[PDB]
Ligand binder design. Structure first.
Ligand SMILES: CCCCCCCCCCCCCCCCCC(=O)OC[C@H](COP(=O)([O-])OCC(O)COP(=O)([O-])OC[C@@H](COC(=O)CCCCCCCCCCCCCCCCC)OC(=O)CCCCCCCCCCCCCCCCC)OC(=O)CCCCCCCCCCCCCCCCC
Ligand SMILES: CCCCCCCCCCCCCCCCCC(=O)OC[C@H](COP(=O)([O-])OCC[N+](C)(C)C)OC(=O)CCCCCCCCCCCCCCCCC
Ligand SMILES: CCCCCCCCCCCCCCCCCC(=O)OC[C@H](COP(=O)(O)OCCN)OC(=O)CCCCCCCCCCCCCCCCC
Ligand SMILES: NC(=O)C1=CN([C@@H]2O[C@H](COP(=O)(O)OP(=O)(O)OC[C@H]3O[C@@H](n4cnc5c(N)ncnc54)[C@H](OP(=O)(O)O)[C@@H]3O)[C@@H](O)[C@H]2O)C=CC1
Ligand code: SF4
Ligand code: SF4
Ligand code: SF4
Ligand code: SF4
Ligand code: SF4
Ligand SMILES: [K+]
Ligand SMILES: [Zn+2]
Lengths: 45, 38, 207, 51, 94, 145, 154, 341, 176, 114, 102, 95, 48, 103
């Protein structure tokens, strides 16, 4: 019988990620600061 | 500069061996006999 | 290229042989032997007086640059008049090369501390003193490092027994750990494994 | 990394802590990341490969 | 894998990733615990001829060290200087 | 030798022979070196051992049912290079690597044969000859053994 | 009489075995499998088992690794500094009986020369699950204590 | 000798001493030292115990593997006594309480239980029997504890004629109820004493002396059928002893006399604890009993033991009773108590 | 090749500068870290329900030792002592003699389980598959002496676990 | 017979190092008993120091003496800095050793060791 | 003569049984010599200086642990730091005392 | 077959039993003496002797690679049976 | 085992026992070898 | 809390591994290398195997060399998880230890 042992699939394995992925999120600094001051002014009023 | 030491080498006091296993032991120096089976 | 035999690399063997005689030419005061092994490792065997000059030359010389002390150890060979072989394994990052430097000493003779050449040597020499009893002169802080406080003897000597001379237990009467002569419930079993038939003719010793 | 890399508390506890110069690492016998952290380009898998 | 769509959405938004594609709990994508028998190959020395051990004996080709000098022209270095490493093109700056 | 086999046939099997209570014979292990035959004839001065048949079926033995009961009989165990001849009293009790060898002297007679006392874990396991050219060479009597 | 102390043992025993706090104390290899028992797959904390660094706030000592002669006085010290009741789990061959360094000049041939041991967990190292089996075996030992029943009959 | 009880080794933990001992009452103060000394030399020790197994854990590290064997037993169940003694070559009886419980009184622990052990040990063919009595055992004693010791000492003598009987004075040690007892009176201010402790004389003996004496009796062929008095080297007035206890502990000593009748009232008030009493009326009687002088009995010296002075070992016991300010005072800082020559 | 883990000069445009001022003052990167542990709070935990659920093992697992038999019930061990010679821990002790029928069999077979390193060398060395390490890992004891196995204990282990031992050997012997 | 010295070039130089060590050990005992809370007396500890010095009084190699002084100094440093524990300090007194009789008859009874 | 044979071969072939027997009792003899061999272990350069006397047991085996030299530099690296920083410096060296102490 | 000595202690298949007066049997008091009651000497004697036709037969113990090393057994002696030195099975030449 | 039962052998335990440590059924070790040295037994009659 | 001097006292886990190895065969000594850096077991095995293979003058087959590199890098992942997460745990960040010890 033919030799059978643990081997990769004939085509090989699919791609494997490894590079760092830290996605960008959030609003600009201007928008965040603007929301905060808008909150304060309504609070004072 | 080398010094002249004029006594037989004795290291018994700096080997850490207990006194019992220096004075009471008998060491045999020999060439082992051939194992007769081979 | 036979599958089961380690391949031989002759370019490195020639390169190491050339540098070996280069070291011997420059330091004839101290170098006693130079050899290269069949797996391409160069060893310099020197007089113990040349520990600092030889190591300093190998660390600093532009054609050496052995900046890293890989390892510093000792071997006990009781049959020799100087039983202790001291072994420095050095690494050269610049020339991607390794060299071994060997010297010798006995029970009562000190060796110059190489700490001034490699600060890595500080603890290696403490280990050699602790396990073999080889004293290093002008060592910044020489004292036991691996054995228990107050431990007597140098365990890595061939004449030190495997199980030592004493053992510990807790004694309830004195409410502390005490040390007593070692007794074993089962003695270690010595095996005589050596075959009475020569294995390697190439290393046969003349009679 | 989302927990440590950009965390200001983590960086405060690690940045400029235990600095070791490249020359000290070599002469002290360091190896591995204790060399590469200081910029020494050295990795035995690259320079003295095995297997 | 049993988490609801709302919870899948919530932990995806909080983490900022698609956690479902790469779950850390293993399900049925793993190998079966009962495998067929192997039939392992043999080595190069499994020949019936032209296979004398003395032609493939590595231990017996080991030799004692070559004595270069024993106390009983251009300058050289231990080896050529190491080449300077090149920066990665995969990702040079993390 | 080589490290593997290319023999793909069935092996010879030989029947065993009783030569007394001291030497057990597993004659399938015999390699027909004829040491035992020569020792018995030359050293022990006893002509009971020999080969019968010829070819692959050549068999070392006595042919008839006979006990090889010399005073020097036990020495054929030592000179037999294989396990074809072994000590019945010693059978199965130890292995060579685990024995401690004590070099001593025999007191069964006034010849002073040099011997090795094999022990293990505080127990005497067997007695072996120790070479001394001027006394017992490399033999010992059966009683000594 | 007998009925009240019988229930009272059940209560003090239940509380003590349901709230077992091992000393944060590991010695060598086996301490790695002790970590894996605290890790998510086995989660010792779910049984009520919580590591606490101080000997004063610990109920169990898990001797996880080789005990050398140099370390032996320190191990006895922190054991003595546990308040009672206290228990010792011997984990791995080294702690159990010296193991693979049994014949070394610098190793204590079993931590039971230094402290009393309640449970011996075999292995080199015992799997994380095997240690968890030992902890649960210690719990069932505590479930059988008869402190008040014996006191009542004194 | 059976081949398995012939001594071997150099006398260490893994050696074989040849002694197979059943120690009754091995979980108490004297028992832990006796078991320790037997295990040290490689003896087989059978420890029949009544307490919870947790309370025997300190005994486990005292012997090599297999050398300490634990069994359950009941002082009234003679089947459980044969099981424990019928493989032994020596039986050691150390059973006793300093108080009477609802279930066992002084007669139980000092007469009925010692007699049962000896009678069962005799039937089992035990060669040797060591029984602990008391120096001050007396039928006419005001202490019922001591009255039972006298009855029990006699009973063990007829039942097992060849028994070694040991009569120690009060024993001092880390876990004693003697030096620790006096040191603990500080919690009440002054130290009450009958007749100001000027009427009682004591000759306390060190725990290790007693233990070595017991162990030497097992091995000494001439200790059979004998009675020994284990006493310390110096006799003290009670007041001098208790004052010395407070000096070594560095605690303020405020003695004041308390009459005999009023100081039984306090003893009766402490007996009400269902736990271990802090003091009892009988404890009061024993502490104020003058230690007997029995020259006709052989002592520790006849068993090869040299008695240890109270001054060498007092600090070993009393250091834990000091405050932080005085924990590190050396042994020399307190002058010895006055002795009775 | 090599790469730089930390050698990036941050941009100095008022938008990037204002972005970092917001990060310093509004704690945005610390809030982001809170998102990660929140996500884990809503993940199924990896904890199994031991002892009702067990961790996965393989047929090669090295557990408690056992001495095996042939189908007839005869012991496989022939006192060759190969296992005793290879044992790195010297945990095996053997004595042998001819049996009453002349068979080569052991009269002592001890394994000090507190010496053993559960390395499996003994079952590699055995030429007859006599000594194996079975699949049992739940045999912790209350005394040291209970872990000093003699031949009777190991033979009982073989009879106890043979059904599983045989099936594991069947699944892995073709890799040996 | 010309060898490299360790410290002292001859016995007279070596003996001065011995006495310097002995003074240091003599002065340190009261602190050791105080610091380690040892139950022994200052006299008992100082007698033990004498006993350890007296067992090496037959040496006449200046190198062997230098190593003994080197090991003595290291031994003292561990005590002063409290690297040793009480168990290590009390190992000099062998308190749990049952005395081993040294006469022929007592040895003859107990075993085969000479 | 170095790696043991397959179990099926050992139970069929005389040469295989002899070599299996000898490899698991005496072991393979190694030609006399000494090597320092190192790898890029996860913690650093891990090497052994291995001495062979020609027999089947190593004569000397010195083990080079990278954590040994890293820890020896702990005092040097901690100069001018606080208690909590030294806790971090111990971690950044990545120390396992099995290799440091051996 | 497992036997009990007059002291009641089971006798092992190696013939071990503490004799009366041996203190070491106290270790079994309140516990038990671990004894395997499947005596291999007895079990192998229950196997039938296998008649074969050839002068030489081989035994690998059964199961191919799961048995023992293959050996060859001579069957020329007609007074006794050929026994396998590994597994104890017996063989006989039929006429 | 419902689908693929284990191979039956007459020596395999028909009754599985759980961990018996800490119970009267616990395993107790002991040496399985017989006495090595046989002592001389003196005669039963007086002659001296 | 400023550190004026660090004096690491080691040997509390010294177990004479190097002396013990001299009493073993080359195979018998291999498991001692698992128990050195007991977080990087298979890498320690590789270092010792290369030294013995070099002294023997033999070569492991190509597949074994690939399995060695494969499990050496799997072993590197085990080490760095232990290194980073226990480093973070000491500094006070305990959670990553749990996520990564499931890996
Ligand atoms: C005070 C507060 C406490 C008291 C309030 C009680 C409110 C009711 C709680 C009901 C929970 C019942 C859970 C359930 O159905 O188990 C089914 C479960 C079968 O389901 P399954 O097959 O395992 O599959 C589960 C899902 O696939 C996998 O599970 P899942 O992750 O997909 O979750 C399913 C479901 C479960 O949620 C609920 O049903 C309860 C929601 C109440 C939210 C309160 C906050 O959640 C949802 O469907 C999404 C909406 C839930 C609100 C999420 C809001 C998150 C907070 C916002 C983020 C910011 C945080 C800062 O059977 C059980 O195991 C029964 C266990 C019983 C546990 C106790 C239940 C009572 C809880 C305590 C009551 C007080 C005592
Ligand atoms: C948030 C608040 C939570 C508070 C939780 C409080 C606990 C609630 C559960 C109580 C259950 C009963 C606990 C009993 C535990 C006793 C400790 C023990 O196990 O010792 C074993 C001892 C047995 O010791 P022994 O007599 O067998 O032997 C001891 C000697 N050696 C060590 C040598 C063995 O138990 C006892 O002595 C008595 C048991 C008493 C049980 C009833 C409690 C009464 C205690 C009153 C004490 C008197 C002072 C008053 C204190 C104030 C009380 C409120
Ligand atoms: C109309 C006119 C209006 C006038 C008024 C206008 C005012 C608006 C603008 C005011 C500024 C807004 C921000 C105020 C909050 C304080 C900001 C702050 O102090 O952040 C800086 C501080 C230090 O950060 P660092 O970068 O290390 O130091 C500077 C480097 N030299 O960073 C830190 O504090 C680090 C904190 C670490 C610990 C954080 C752990 C908790 C984090 C999660 C909590 C999230 C917030 C919860 C709020 C709960 C409210 C109930
Ligand atoms: N000062 C002294 O210490 C002196 C002591 N003695 C005698 O020496 C012996 C031991 O002294 P000590 O060890 O201090 O006494 P302890 O009270 O310290 O220990 C006594 C032992 O007896 C056991 N015991 C007590 N009552 C019973 C009972 N009813 N049933 C079963 N076992 C019981 C206890 O077991 P548990 O722990 O299970 O209760 C304990 O192990 C006693 O006979 C004592 O009278 C003689 C002179 C002075
Ligand atoms: S000595 Fe042995 S091998 Fe040689 S012929 Fe005689 S029986 Fe056969
Ligand atoms: S040990 Fe020698 S004689 Fe015996 S079977 Fe093996 S090769 Fe043949
Ligand atoms: S028992 Fe095994 S895993 Fe545990 S410390 Fe010892 S060698 Fe390491
Ligand atoms: S597993 Fe290893 S250590 Fe344990 S008995 Fe087998 S060979 Fe010895
Ligand atoms: S168990 Fe196997 S290797 Fe060990 S002695 Fe028996 S047959 Fe030989
Ligand atoms: K032979
Ligand atoms: Zn067969």
């Amino acid at each position: 019988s033919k030799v059978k042992q643990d081997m990769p699939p004939v085509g090989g394995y699919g791609p494997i990620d490894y590079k760092r992925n830290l996605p960008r999120r959030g609003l600009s600094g201007y928008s965040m600061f603007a929301v905060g001051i808008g909150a304060l002014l309504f609070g004072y009023w | 500069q080398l010094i002249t030491v004029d006594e037989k080498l004795d290291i018994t006091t700096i080997t850490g061996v207990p006194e019992e296993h220096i004075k009471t032991r008998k060491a045999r120096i020999f060439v082992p006999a051939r194992n007769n089976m081979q | 290229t036979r599958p089961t035999v380690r391949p031989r690399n002759d370019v490195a063997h020639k390169q190491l042989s050339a540098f070996g005689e280069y070291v011997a030419e420059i330091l004839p005061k101290y170098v006693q032997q130079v050899q290269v092994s069949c797996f391409n490792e160069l060893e310099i065997c020197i007089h113990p007086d040349g520990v600092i000059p030889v190591l300093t030359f190998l660390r600093d010389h532009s054609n050496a640059q052995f900046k890293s002390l890989a390892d510093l150890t000792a071997v006990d060979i009781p049959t020799r008049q100087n039983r202790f072989e001291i072994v420095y394994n050095l690494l050269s990052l610049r020339f991607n090369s390794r060299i071994r430097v060997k010297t010798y000493t006995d029970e009562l003779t000190p060796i110059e501390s190489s700490v001034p050449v490699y600060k890595a040597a500080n603890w290696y020499e403490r280990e050699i003193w602790d396990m073999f009893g080889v004293f290093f002169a002008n060592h910044p802080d020489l004292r036991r490092i691996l054995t228990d406080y107050g431990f007597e003897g140098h365990p890595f000597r061939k004449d030190f027994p495997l199980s030592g001379y004493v053992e510990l237990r807790y004694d309830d009467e004195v409410k502390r750990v005490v040390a007593e002569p070692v007794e074993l419930a089962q003695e270690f079993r010595k095996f005589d494994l050596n075959s009475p038939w020569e294995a390697f003719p190439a290393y046969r010793q003349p009679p | 990394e989302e927990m440590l890399t950009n965390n200001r508390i983590w960086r405060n506890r690690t940045v400029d802590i235990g600095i070791v110069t490249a020359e000290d690492a070599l002469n002290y016998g360091f190896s591995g990341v204790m060399l590469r952290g200081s910029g020494i380009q050295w990795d035995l898998r690259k320079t003295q490969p095995y297997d | 894998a049993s988490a609801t769509r709302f919870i899948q959405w919530l932990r995806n938004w909080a983490s900022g990733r698609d956690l479902q594609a790469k779950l850390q709990l293993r399900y049925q994508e793993i190998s079966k615990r009962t495998q067929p028998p192997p039939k392992l190959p043999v080595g190069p020395s499994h020949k019936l001829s032209n296979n004398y051990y003395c032609t493939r004996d590595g231990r017996r080709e080991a030799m004692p060290p070559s004595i270069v000098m024993s106390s009983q022209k251009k300058a050289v270095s231990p080896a050529p200087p190491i080449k300077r490493w090149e920066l990665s093109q995969d990702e040079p700056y993390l | 030798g080589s490290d593997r086999s290319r023999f793909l046939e069935g092996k010879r099997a030989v029947e065993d022979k009783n030569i007394g209570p001291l030497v057990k014979t597993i004659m399938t292990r015999c390699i027909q070196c004829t040491r035992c035959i020569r020792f018995a004839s030359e050293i022990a001065g006893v002509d009971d051992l020999g080969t019968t048949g010829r070819g692959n079926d050549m068999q070392v033995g006595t042919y008839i049912e006979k006990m090889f009961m010399s005073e020097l009989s036990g020495n054929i165990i030592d000179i037999c290079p294989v396990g074809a001849l072994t000590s019945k009293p010693y059978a199965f009790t130890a292995r060579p690597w685990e024995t401690r060898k004590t070099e001593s002297i025999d007191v069964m007679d006034a010849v002073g044969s040099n011997i090795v006392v094999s022990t293990r874990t505080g127990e005497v396991m067997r007695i072996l000859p120790r070479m001394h050219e001027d006394i017992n060479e490399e033999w010992i009597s059966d009683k000594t053994r | 009489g007998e009925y009240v102390v019988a229930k009272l043992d059940d209560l003090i025993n239940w509380a003590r075995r349901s709230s077992l706090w091992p000393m944060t104390f590991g010695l060598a290899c086996c301490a790695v499998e002790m970590m894996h028992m605290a890790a998510p797959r086995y989660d010792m904390d779910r049984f009520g088992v919580v590591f606490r660094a101080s000997p004063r706030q610990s109920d169990v000592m898990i001797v996880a690794g080789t005990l050398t002669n140099k370390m032996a006085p320190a191990l006895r010290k922190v054991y003595d500094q546990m308040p009672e009741p206290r228990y010792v789990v011997s984990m791995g061959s080294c702690a159990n009986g010296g193991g693979y360094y049994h014949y070394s000049y610098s190793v204590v041939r079993g931590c039971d020369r230094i402290v009393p041991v309640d449970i011996y967990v075999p292995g080199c190292p015992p799997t994380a699950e095997a240690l968890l089996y030992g902890i649960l075996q210690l719990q069932k030992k505590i479930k059988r204590e008869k402190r008040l029943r014996i006191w009542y009959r004194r | 000798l059976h081949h398995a009880v012939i001594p071997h080794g150099k006398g260490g933990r893994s050696s074989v001493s040849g002694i197979v001992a059943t120690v009754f009452g091995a979980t108490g103060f004297l028992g832990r030292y006796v078991v320790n000394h037997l295990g040290r030399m490689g003896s087989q020790v059978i420890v029949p115990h009544r307490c919870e197994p947790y309370d025997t854990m300190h005994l486990r590290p005292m012997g090599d593997l297999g050398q300490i064997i634990f069994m359950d037993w009941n002082g009234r169940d003679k089947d459980s006594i044969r099981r424990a003694v019928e493989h032994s070559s020596v039986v050691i009886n150390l059973v006793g309480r300093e108080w009477e419980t609802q279930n066992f009184d002084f007669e139980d622990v000092f007469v009925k239980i010692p007699q049962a052990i000896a009678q069962v040990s005799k039937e089992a063919g035990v060669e040797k029997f060591i029984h602990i009595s008391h120096l001050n055992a007396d039928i006419k004693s005001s202490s019922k504890y001591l009255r039972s010791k006298a009855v029990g000492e006699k009973e063990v003598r007829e039942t097992f004629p060849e028994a070694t009987i040991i009569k120690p004075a009060e024993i001092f040690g880390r876990e004693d109820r003697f030096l620790n007892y006096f040191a603990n009176i500080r919690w009440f201010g002054g130290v009450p004493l009958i007749s100001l402790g000027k009427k009682t004389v004591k000759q306390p003996v060190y725990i290790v002396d007693v233990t070595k004496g017991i162990i030497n009796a097992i091995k000494d062929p001439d200790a059979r059928g004998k009675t020994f008095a284990f006493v310390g080297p110096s006799r003290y007035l009670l007041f001098d002893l208790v004052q010395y206890v407070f000096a070594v502990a560095h605690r303020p000593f405020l003695p004041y006399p308390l009459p005999h009748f009023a100081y039984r009232w306090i003893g009766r008030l402490f007996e009400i604890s269902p736990f271990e009493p802090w003091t009892t009326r009988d404890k009061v009687e024993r502490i104020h009993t003058t230690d007997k002088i029995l020259p006709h009995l052989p002592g520790l010296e006849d068993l090869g033991v040299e008695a240890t002075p109270l001054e060498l070992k007092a600090i070993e016991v009393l250091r834990r009773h000091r405050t932080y300010r005085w924990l590190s005072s050396e042994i020399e800082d307190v002058q010895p108590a006055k002795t009775i020559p | 090749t090599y790469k730089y883990v930390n050698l990036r000069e941050p941009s100095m445009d008022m938008k990037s500068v204002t972005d970092r001022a917001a990060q310093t003052l509004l704690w945005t990167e610390l809030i982001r870290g809170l998102g990660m542990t929140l996500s884990y709070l809503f993940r199924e935990p990896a904890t199994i329900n031991y002892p009702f659920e067990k961790g996965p093992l393989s047929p090669r697992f090295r557990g408690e030792h056992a001495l095996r038999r042939y189908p007839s019930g005869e012991e496989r061990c022939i006192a060759c002592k190969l296992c005793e010679a290879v044992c790195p821990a010297q945990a095996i002790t053997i004595e042998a003699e001819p049996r009453a029928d002349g068979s080569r069999r052991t009269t002592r077979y001890d394994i000090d389980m507190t010496k053993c390193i559960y390395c499996g060398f003994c079952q590699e060395a055995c030429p007859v598959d006599a000594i194996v390490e079975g699949p049992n890992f739940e045999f912790s004891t209350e005394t040291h002496e209970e872990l000093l196995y003699n031949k009777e204990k190991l033979l009982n282990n073989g009879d106890k676990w043979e059904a599983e031992i045989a099936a594991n050997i069947q699944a892995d012997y073709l890799y040996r | 017979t010309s060898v490299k010295p360790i410290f002292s070039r001859d016995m007279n130089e070596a003996k001065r190092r011995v006495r310097e060590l002995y003074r240091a050990w003599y002065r340190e005992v009261p602190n050791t008993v105080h610091l380690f809370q040892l139950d022994i007396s200052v006299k008992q500890g100082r007698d033990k120091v004498r006993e350890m010095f007296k067992k090496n009084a037959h040496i006449t190699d200046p190198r062997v003496v230098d190593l003994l002084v080197i090991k003595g100094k290291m031994e003292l440093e561990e005590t002063i800095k409290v690297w040793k524990q009480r168990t290590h300090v009390m190992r000099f007194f062998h308190e749990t050793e049952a005395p081993r009789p040294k006469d022929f008859l007592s040895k003859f009874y107990v075993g085969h060791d000479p | 003569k170095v790696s043991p044979p397959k179990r099926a071969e050992m139970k069929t072939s005389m040469e295989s049984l002899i070599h299996h027997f000898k490899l698991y009792t005496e072991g393979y003899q190694v030609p006399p010599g000494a090597t320092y061999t190192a790898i890029e272990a996860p913690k650093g350069e891990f090497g052994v200086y291995l001495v062979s006397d020609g027999s089947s047991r190593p004569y000397r085996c010195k083990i080079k642990a990278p954590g040994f030299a890293h820890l020896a530099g702990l005092d040097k690296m901690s100069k001018g730091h606080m208690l909590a920083d030294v806790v971090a410096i111990i971690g950044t060296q990545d120390i396992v005392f099995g290799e440091v102490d051996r | 077959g497992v036997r009990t000595s007059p002291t009641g202690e089971k006798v092992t298949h190696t013939g071990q039993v503490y004799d009366d007066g041996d203190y070491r049997k106290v270790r079994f008091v309140g516990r038990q003496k671990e004894v395997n009651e499947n005596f291999a000497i007895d079990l192998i004697a229950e196997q039938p002797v296998s008649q074969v036709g050839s002068r030489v037969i081989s035994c690998d113990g059964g199961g191919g690679a799961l048995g023992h090393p293959r050996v060859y057994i001579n069957l020329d002696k007609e007074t006794k049976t050929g026994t396998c030195g590994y597994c104890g099975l017996q063989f006989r030449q039929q006429h | 085992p419902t689908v693929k039962p284990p191979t039956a052998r007459k020596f395999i335990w028909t009754n599985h026992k759980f961990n018996l440590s800490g119970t009267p059924q616990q395993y107790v070790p002991y040496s399985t070898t017989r006495k090595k040295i046989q002592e001389w037994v003196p005669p039963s009659t007086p002659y001296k | 809390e400023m550190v004026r001097k660090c004096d690491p006292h080691i040997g509390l886990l010294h177990r004479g591994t190097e002396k013990l190895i001299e009493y073993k065969t080359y195979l018998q000594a291999l498991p001692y290398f698992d128990r050195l850096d007991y977080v990087s077991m298979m890498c320690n095995e590789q270092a010792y195997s290369l030294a013995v293979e070099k002294l023997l003058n033999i070569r492991p087959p190509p597949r074994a060399q690939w399995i060695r590199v494969l499990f050496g890098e799997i072993t590197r992942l085990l080490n760095h998880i232990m290194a980073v997460t226990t480093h973070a745990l000491d500094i006070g960040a305990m959670t990553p230890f749990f996520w990564m010890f499931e890996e």
